[PDB]
Amino acid sequence: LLEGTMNLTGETQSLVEQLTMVKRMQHIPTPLFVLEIWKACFVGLIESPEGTEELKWTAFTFLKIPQVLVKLKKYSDFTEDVNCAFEFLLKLTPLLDKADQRCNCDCTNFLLQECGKQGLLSEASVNNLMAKRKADREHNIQPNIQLILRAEPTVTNILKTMDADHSKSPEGLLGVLGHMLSGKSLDLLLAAAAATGKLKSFARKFINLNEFTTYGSEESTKPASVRALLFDISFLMLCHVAQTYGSEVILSESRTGAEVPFFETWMQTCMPEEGKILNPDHPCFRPDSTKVESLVALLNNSSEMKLVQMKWHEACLSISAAILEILNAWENGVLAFESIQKITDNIKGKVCSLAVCAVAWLVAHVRMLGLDEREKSLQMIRQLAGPLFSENTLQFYNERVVIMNSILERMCADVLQQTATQIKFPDTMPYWNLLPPKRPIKEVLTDIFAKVLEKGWVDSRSIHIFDTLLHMGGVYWFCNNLIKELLKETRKEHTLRAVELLYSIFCLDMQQVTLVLLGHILPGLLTDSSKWHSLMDPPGTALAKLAVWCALSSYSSASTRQKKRHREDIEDYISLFPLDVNMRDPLNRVLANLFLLISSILGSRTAGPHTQFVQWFMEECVDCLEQSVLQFMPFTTVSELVKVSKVVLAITDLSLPLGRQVAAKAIAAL
Amino acid sequence: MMDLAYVCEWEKWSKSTHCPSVPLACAWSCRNLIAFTMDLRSDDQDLTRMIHILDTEHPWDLHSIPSEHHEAITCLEWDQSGSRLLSADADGQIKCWSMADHLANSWESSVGSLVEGDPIVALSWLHNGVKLALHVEKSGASSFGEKFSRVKFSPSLTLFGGKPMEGWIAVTVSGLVTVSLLKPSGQVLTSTESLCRLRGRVALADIAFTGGGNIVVATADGSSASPVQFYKVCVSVVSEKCRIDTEILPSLFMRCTTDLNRKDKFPAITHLKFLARDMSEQVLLCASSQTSSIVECWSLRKETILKWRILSATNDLDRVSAVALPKLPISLTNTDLKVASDTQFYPGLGLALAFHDGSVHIVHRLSLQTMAVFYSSVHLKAMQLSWTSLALVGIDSHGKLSVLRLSPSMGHPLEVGLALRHLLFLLEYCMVTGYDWWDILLHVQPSMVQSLVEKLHEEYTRQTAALQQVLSTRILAMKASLCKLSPCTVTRVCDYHTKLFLIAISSTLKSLLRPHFLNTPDKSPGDRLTEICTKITDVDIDKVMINLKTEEFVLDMNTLQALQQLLQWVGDFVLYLLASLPNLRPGHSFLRDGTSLGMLRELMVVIRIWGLLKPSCLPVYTATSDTQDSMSLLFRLLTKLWICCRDEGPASEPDEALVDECCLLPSQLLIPSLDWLPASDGLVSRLQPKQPLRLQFGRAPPKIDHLRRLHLGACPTEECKACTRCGCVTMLKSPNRTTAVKQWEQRWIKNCLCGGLWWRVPLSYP
Amino acid sequence: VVADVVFVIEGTANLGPYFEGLRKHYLLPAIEYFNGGPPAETDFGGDYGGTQYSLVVFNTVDCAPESYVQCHAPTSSAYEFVTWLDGIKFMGGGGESCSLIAEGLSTALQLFDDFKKMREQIGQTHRVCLLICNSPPYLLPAVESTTYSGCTTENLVQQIGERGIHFSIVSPRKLPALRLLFEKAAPPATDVSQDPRHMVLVRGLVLPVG
Amino acid sequence: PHWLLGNLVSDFVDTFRPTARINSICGRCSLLPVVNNSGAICNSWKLDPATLRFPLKGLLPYDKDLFEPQTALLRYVLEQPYSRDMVCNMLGLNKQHKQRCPVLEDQLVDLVVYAMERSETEEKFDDGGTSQLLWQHLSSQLIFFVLFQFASFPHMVLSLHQKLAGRGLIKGRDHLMWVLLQFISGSIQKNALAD
Ligand SMILES: [Zn+2]
């Protein structure tokens, strides 16, 4: 459910590696494992909000999850186990009926035919399962699943046909692209391409189309008025991709030569994202003084009448300075409001991407301003993002208006949250502004963790609030408060469930959470003499399990906020852990320090609950391992652990030639 | 320049193992008390939750408040006075520690706020509207109104009068801000409110105040490519409750992100600091990579009307580990910059920047060019300049706590008159305020001491006759503490302290006599007594006592009996002085001071009257004869000494008749012994330039109560307070709560007479 | 009747031992006269019409970085005022005889200005100021006050005496300067002292004759 | 458990989870009666007067909600008209003996602050709008429960003061004052004024 909610566009190999990890940590039978995959997928589909998220969830269950199962089959008698899991699932009639009411069709039929196509299931199994499902079921628009399952081959074939610009026929390109701009067709193609790993090539194709249509050639009005529309369609769909599926699918990741495209630089330096706030007087927003006067004269001329040669990248880069001079003119008073209306109509009318570039600079500039100084510039957005200017539209105007209104919603939302301002473009932002306005943020955390424990699984909305709290209060505060809420449980059942949930919650940034957990929380609980009454057997065994699962999963080795924040972070782990493979990698340093602490606790006097804790930690280090986290164990632990009470030697030693000597010493002298 | 005054280390309690370090707090008060936390980490984590109070003159004695802070202490903050300490940790919980029984060794918090779960990231007391500016170009101007002048600042939240409320404002790691207002009663009002509607991370924050009673709070989320946002907060009280009104101000981005050559380095803003609280228009930022850093200064200045423009920035540094901003409120304008560059006055123009190597840079405020460099020969994890900014304290990446002295001209050699004028200017600033002057005595060389004392007396004169009233005991304390510092002048300090004690007795005895009826009105009976004792120069005590309306000098014969020990000190000091006359000793100054001998005469006369009312109040003298009137004998010799000095323009050397009569005094009476107050354990006399003292904490490299003159035993059973400056000892609780002269005991509840604080001394148990 | 009562007390070591006696003999009866019958726990604050009490406590210059005056907000409860009078701790003092009467009187003036902006339902009321002091004034002009800075005690007590504020002095030790200040605060156009030593001159208010 | 026993006892009690799972009416927290004034109370709805918990047979490990105070049931019954005898049969009140039952008192206070909240929502769109009906029923119910000292007046008033302190609930304070006037006007002569 986490991989469905946060990164649909992630590669399947990382997910297969993580799932095989989880299957090896807690020893999970294969039918129950695949059953939990299908149950999670269907529950997340039912709980999805209506709109793009529902399309994305249908793609994840229908396309990505069947591919993941195929990779598991190669890595691992899988057909018998997946057939068993399908019978396990087909007992759950209320889940499947809720799903069928949301799917508007029987979605289990499409699942069984899809798993038949991938080869997870034999055909006789498929047919008797569909017979059972029809018997249990007995008691004009195509649904989204058929659209997606047929739209993935259109993704491949649209790649292969628009490699060549429809044999350089821009009228054909425009018609097919307008059909894509029609309702929901773009979203269907993007959801299929995201779930099937082909969003990068799709973005490369539209970016290359954009580079081709940037300059243009000697042309009369009719050919150019097609070329500017191609620029608009490619630009608006690229902005919609970058706002929905993240910006890192737009990046080229290696550009040999300086010829980075226009849209990549514009998105890099000029488009607001979630964690990106922009400098309005960055040198990117001040290209020249020469072209910008030509452009303000161009906007004050009339209907451009000169779209026959515009070099649209230069125009779009220059609009920021242009509206800056317009704003200074209006702040002095030398321009009337009625001429402002004329300039905004000349911007937003013929080409809609100009409005997006202007609104991006306006959002940066309004974010920098004070409270009382804002009032004029917001009116500019009200005219740039207003309803349609009419009677000179090129073609496909209403659909570009719809996509543009979505992009401007997601650009302006933060600034229009700072001051209570309604622009009212007409849900498209279903998980946005989730925290209560005044409540301290630990109450939010404890309430959501209480509800996740009492349900037994993590919702999608709960995943989004947990992400915002991890970004807001930081890793240490987050991990410490969740572990406190663990340690005040008193039942065996609730402690084991809380740990099995907290591992997945910590999979937001597993690596940093393990550094905080094994470096700050656990040494503070083991070293403080007042604290270790909290380390009693009910919560203590569960906590030791969570620490060893975190250590193993971090050793063997994910969201965009977490990528940005770890790139922000500066710390000296050599100075933090002085320590009396690389050993400049911080996780090796934390593990070496923790095992020194464990040996020191086992060797000392005053046995208490903390000694029981380090016993349990070493025992699940032994049991959870296949064979290595225990490569960092000091060899004195081999002697001491059976002083404090076989296999806990023979696994922990890692079997070097000197390691046999310590092994044979301990095992013979038990 | 920089000299390490001392390095105080823990003994064997270092080597924190297996648990990583934490950031430290440090706070230097107006009185010289350092409050700081350290990472001790031995057998408990509460050893990282203890707040150490270190009086800067006796560092070995470190008090350790066991704060009940469940997470790590983020911020420490002294009052505008020095009397309370705010401490806030992660997960809310601001506690307000106050002194217990006015001891600087016992702290206890009754008042606090709590925003649970949210880590406090900035904390400040509210501003009480007092702000003064120092005009260095008027250093010779011979009036304290010209040198230091109040600058018309308004306090946030005035309540029904001119009186500001006291309270704090804290900023959490979420968007939340909270204000707590302490009533004059024990009540406390809290209110929390988000800073802006877009709730977001506040990883660094800072608080300044403005004229107009507006708080200005700056927030950053550490990313260094995101804006440093600014909010104006206005506090109000609506009819029962606090009310917070916030408003966005112009944010700023940061240079080195628009550098465009290599902009990706320095990705973390690590310190955000206004240049001083109440200086809300300038902001110091410090971007840092793993190895290098940049500090920058910005200013709000208007032309978009208000707009943050950069002032200056350093080139490239090491990674800045700590930052200390000055506290001396210089006047900062262009003429004062000129005269402080000409006459090399540099105390208020420095910031200190520690680095991740050993070095420390004292750098200019306005254009951040390095003024001095001190190489440690391990890094400073917390620094704090002093209130006169002559010394900076600093806690290292070990247990070590060091105090460095910064010279006022930053190592450039000055002629002696300029150094005299600088240190005299600072001592006058500490005299007008009540701040402590210990850091100044770090910089006073012995060879200048006497000249400096002369200048103080000349500046004690030529003020406007009410300043001379209010600066009396402050200048006696400063004179004594200066004269401690030189071997030529070390003999006089005892005199100064007895002078304080004499005045402290004299007025109080003249305070006790309530005239039962007003005869010869418009003169209080202190003045009638002084007039009568100065016009009647009769050598007999009876002839003076006759003419003094002795039905007026009446007490209730209970307090009159309880005054016995103070009257005993008066008689014994008179006898010691007169026997000391034939001989540099503890009494040498008093033999030629006509005024003090007049005071001793007046006390002997009122002692005679009170002895006739009740004979048990009198001092006792072991007389080597039984037909003797010892009081009349000492009064005869005192009048004959005092008529020497009560002449106009006299300096009469004492004649031989007095010399032989005072040679006969050990024959007639037994001269007892006396305790002299400054039992000197201060470091400033012990220190030398170019040699740092290396101390251990708690190692510390005929017992009387000096204020109520009670003899404790050999090893005293009742516990005691010691003054931190002079060193006088008093027992902690009064011996007889029924018979206690509260007019005398209640003077020294909060301080000593010299001015320093009390500090509880531990019992021996031999 | 409606009264704006302001007490100005010297919180120093002198007035330390004598305060308890003064309260029983003079201060407590004076509060009762304004509030008929002694107060006990039923009196509620917040009636902006009615009698409103206030404290101003001042100090000498030995509380060197601390503030000089501690003022309390107005209360309509006589009982809260009694608890405030218990809550004073007399800890100050040192080697001096004088105190900062100018500061206490200037903040009393600011109290009476804020009272005058408060009560507009009545134009003028019984505006009573008491000074419970044991010490002659300093020669400092007032420093820690706005709108009454740079004023000596004589100028401030002239401004108290004009505009119709009834100024009273209760002192446990008979003094010349206090008598001169009382004579100066004469409103425009009886032995109340129970103990002979006490000097009590009350321009306004009725106290049982002793 | 003690740190020496530990798992040995805890896991043991966990194996008695299915037996407790057999002996639990599922959804018992969300089942509500229809309040009839007839008497002859079914003993399913009886609560514990000390702690508002359901009385449970045995010492088994029951489900975590059955150890919580059932305030939802008691608030639903107190909001109904003519639920006077049913609340006494629930909390075991007897009316021959006066007791000052505390959890009843806290539930009545929370009912008052809920009525104050729902009055402060609008109360002006619909004139009846269930608000003034709720305040009338609150008058009658609270008169009975404070009059026989099953709850007490001044603890109720000062706890009510602590709930309304700082919450800023002012639109229907006249109704709350009216209800308090019913108590005072009912029983001023019986008690001292310090109450
Ligand atoms: Zn002293």
Swiss-Prot record, chain A:
Q: LXXLL motif 3: where is this motif?
A: 186-190
Question: Where along the sequence does the record place the motif called LXXLL motif 4?
Answer: 295-299
Q: Does the keyword Phosphoprotein apply?
A: yes
Motif LXXLL motif 5, residue range(s) on this chain = 522-526
Molecular function as annotated in GO: nuclear thyroid hormone receptor binding; nuclear vitamin D receptor binding; transcription coactivator activity; transcription coregulator activity
Q: Where is this motif: LXXLL motif 2?
A: 92-96
Q: Which family does it belong to?
A: Belongs to the Mediator complex subunit 24 family.
**What is the source species?**
Homo sapiens
Q: Tissue expression, per UniProt?
A: Ubiquitous. Abundant in skeletal muscle, heart and placenta.
One biological process term in Gene Ontology: positive regulation of transcription elongation by RNA polymerase II
Under the subunit heading, UniProt states: Component of the Mediator complex, which is composed of MED1, MED4, MED6, MED7, MED8, MED9, MED10, MED11, MED12, MED13, MED13L, MED14, MED15, MED16, MED17, MED18, MED19, MED20, MED21, MED22, MED23, MED24, MED25, MED26, MED27, MED29, MED30, MED31, CCNC, CDK8 and CDC2L6/CDK11. The MED12, MED13, CCNC and CDK8 subunits form a distinct module termed the CDK8 module. Mediator containing the CDK8 module is less active than Mediator lacking this module in supporting transcriptional activation.
Q: Name one GO cellular component term.
A: nucleus
Q: Does the keyword Transcription regulation apply?
A: yes
Q: Which UniProt keywords apply?
A: Activator, Nucleus, Phosphoprotein, Repeat, Transcription, Transcription regulation
Full protein name: Mediator of RNA polymerase II transcription subunit 24
Q: Where in the cell does this protein reside? A: Nucleus
What gene is behind this protein? Answer: MED24
What stretch of the parent protein is included here?
249 to 989 of 989
UniProtKB/Swiss-Prot annotation, chain B:
| Keyword set, alphabetical order | Activator, Nucleus, Repeat, Transcription, Transcription regulation, WD repeat
> Where would you find the membrane-spanning parts of this chain?
none
Q: Name one GO molecular function term.
A: nuclear vitamin D receptor binding
Sorted alphabetically, the Gene Ontology cellular component annotations on this record are:
core mediator complex; mediator complex; membrane; nucleoplasm; nucleus
WD repeats at which positions? 10-60, 61-108, 109-154, 155-192, 193-246, 247-303, 304-377, 378-409, 410-444
Any one biological process term the GO annotation gives: positive regulation of transcription initiation by RNA polymerase II
Compartments annotated for it: namely: Nucleus
Entry function: Component of the Mediator complex, a coactivator involved in the regulated transcription of nearly all RNA polymerase II-dependent genes. Mediator functions as a bridge to convey information from gene-specific regulatory proteins to the basal RNA polymerase II transcription machinery. Mediator is recruited to promoters by direct interactions with regulatory proteins and serves as a scaffold for the assembly of a functional preinitiation complex with RNA polymerase II and the general transcription factors.
UniProt-recorded name of the protein? Mediator of RNA polymerase II transcription subunit 16
Swiss-Prot record, chain C:
**What is its subcellular localisation?**
Nucleus
Alphabetically list the UniProt keywords.
Activator, Charcot-Marie-Tooth disease, Disease variant, Intellectual disability, Methylation, Neurodegeneration, Neuropathy, Nucleus, Transcription, Transcription regulation
Citing just one GO molecular function, the answer is: nuclear retinoic acid receptor binding
Tissue specificity of this protein:
Ubiquitously expressed. Highest levels in brain, heart, kidney, peripheral leukocytes, placenta, skeletal muscle and spleen.
Q: How does it assemble?
A: Component of the Mediator complex, which is composed of MED1, MED4, MED6, MED7, MED8, MED9, MED10, MED11, MED12, MED13, MED13L, MED14, MED15, MED16, MED17, MED18, MED19, MED20, MED21, MED22, MED23, MED24, MED25, MED26, MED27, MED29, MED30, MED31, CCNC, CDK8 and CDC2L6/CDK11. The MED12, MED13, CCNC and CDK8 subunits form a distinct module termed the CDK8 module. Mediator containing the CDK8 module is less active than Mediator lacking this module in supporting transcriptional activation.
Q: What is the lineage of its organism?
A: Eukaryota, Metazoa, Chordata, Craniata, Vertebrata
Which residues does the annotated region (Interaction with the Mediator complex) include? 1-205
Q: Give the protein name, as stated in the record.
A: Mediator of RNA polymerase II transcription subunit 25
Its family remark reads: Belongs to the Mediator complex subunit 25 family.
Q: What is its main location?
A: nucleus
Q: Which GO terms describe its cellular component?
A: core mediator complex; mediator complex; nucleoplasm; nucleus; transcription regulator complex
> Can you name the source organism?
Homo sapiens (Human)
Q: Describe which stretch of the whole protein the shown chain covers, with first residue, last residue and complete length.
A: 14 to 231 of 747
Q: Which gene encodes it?
A: MED25
Curated annotation (Swiss-Prot), chain D:
Compartments (UniProt record): Nucleus
Q: How does it assemble?
A: Interacts with ELK1. Component of the Mediator complex, which is composed of MED1, MED4, MED6, MED7, MED8, MED9, MED10, MED11, MED12, MED13, MED13L, MED14, MED15, MED16, MED17, MED18, MED19, MED20, MED21, MED22, MED23, MED24, MED25, MED26, MED27, MED29, MED30, MED31, CCNC, CDK8 and CDC2L6/CDK11. The MED12, MED13, CCNC and CDK8 subunits form a distinct module termed the CDK8 module. Mediator containing the CDK8 module is less active than Mediator lacking this module in supporting transcriptional activation.
Q: Which disease is it linked to?
A: Intellectual developmental disorder, autosomal recessive 18, with or without epilepsy: A disorder characterized by significantly below average general intellectual functioning associated with impairments in adaptive behavior and manifested during the developmental period.
Family named by the database record: Belongs to the Mediator complex subunit 23 family.
Q: What does this protein do?
A: Required for transcriptional activation subsequent to the assembly of the pre-initiation complex. Component of the Mediator complex, a coactivator involved in the regulated transcription of nearly all RNA polymerase II-dependent genes. Mediator functions as a bridge to convey information from gene-specific regulatory proteins to the basal RNA polymerase II transcription machinery.
Q: Source species, please?
A: Homo sapiens
- As recorded in Swiss-Prot or TrEMBL, the protein's gene is named MED23
